[PDB]
Design a protein around this ligand. Structure first.
Ligand SMILES: O=c1[nH]c(=S)[nH]c2[nH]ccc12
Length: 267
DNA sequence: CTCTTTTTTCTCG
DNA sequence: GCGAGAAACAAAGA
């Protein structure tokens, strides 16, 4: 999941578990709780969920006044709300039980993580990760963006994926964004001219906000997304580009599968 | 059978 | 510092 999917999950959860007292917490895979499962179980049991926030691709459960549970879904994490008598499925790892249902985390690849941290440590947590601004007009300052691009000789796609120029892009939306901004994924950032950086900036915001409105891409909470029907290049190798009669090509860039339209995305 | 494919952190040179 | 490659892991396809 990328920012749009995580935000969809955040919204569904917010409407359903906020106000719910945690009756108990159980784990078949305690190892994904990086700060210690027993400590998390002791601290959160009996607490009421106050809210759910999000920063980049990170889910943030506000639980009691003084704790936050930072959940990352990584590649295939999935939450669902189930009745208490629901049967365990093979890749279920954690469950948070309420009086009238339960929140189950499942993750085939076991990459997802939970971290318990205190409220006044949330901002420091994200500062230490150097997570960039949220992809909104109010937060994503183009001027700083522009100066960071001009100082680097990194390729634009992997640099955007680092989450430090701006938060929330992953492989799908970085490919869509670069297609929309007519930029080559291996373009070195210091060769980007001002007008391209401007288009890149706005496209990042516009694509991510559109995907949020369409409830994310779906290829469980957040499983009713429609953004996948609007994808222009990701996973569409060999099919025609929607800007010219060329075909989508797929290459490897700094380890990632990369879909782009050669003719519309020259350096 | 082998090899490759699908977020973030770590290692090595 | 850097970039490349691999690692965490499971399942599927070639
Ligand atoms: O290289 C990265 N690619 C993605 S998708 N997320 C990241 N976080 C930190 C580094 C990276």
């Amino acid at each position: 999941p990328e920012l749009p999917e995580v935000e969809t999950v955040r919204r569904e959860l917010e409407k359903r578990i906020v106000g719910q007292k945690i009756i108990s917490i159980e784990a078949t895979y305690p190892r994904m709780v990086l700060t210690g499962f027993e400590q998390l179980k002791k601290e959160l049991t009996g607490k009421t969920i106050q809210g759910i926030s999000r920063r980049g691709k990170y889910l943030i459960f506000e639980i009691g006044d003084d704790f936050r549970l930072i959940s990352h879904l990584r590649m295939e994490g999935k939450y669902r709300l189930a009745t208490l008598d629901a049967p365990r499925e093979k890749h279920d790892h954690l469950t948070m039980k309420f009086a009238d249902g339960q929140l189950i985390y499942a993750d085939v690849r076991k990459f997802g993580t939970w971290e318990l941290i205190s409220t006044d440590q949330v901002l420091p947590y994200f500062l230490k990760k150097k997570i960039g601004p949220e992809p909104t007009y109010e937060d994503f300052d183009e001027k700083l963006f522009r100066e960071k691009l001009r100082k680097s000789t990194k390729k634009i796609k992997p640099y955007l994926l680092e989450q430090t120029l701006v938060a929330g892009l992953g492989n799908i939306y970085v490919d869509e964004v670069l297609w929309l901004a007519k930029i080559h994924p291996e373009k070195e950032t210091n060769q980007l001219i001002e007008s391209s950086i401007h288009l890149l900036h706005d496209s990042i915001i516009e694509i991510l906000q559109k995907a949020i409105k369409l409830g994310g891409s779906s290829i469980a909470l957040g499983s009713t997304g429609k953004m996948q029907n609007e994808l222009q290049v990701y996973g569409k190798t060999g099919e025609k580009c929607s800007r010219c009669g060329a075909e989508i090509q797929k290459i490897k860039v700094a380890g990632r599968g990369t879909h782009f339209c050669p003719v519309c995305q020259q350096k």
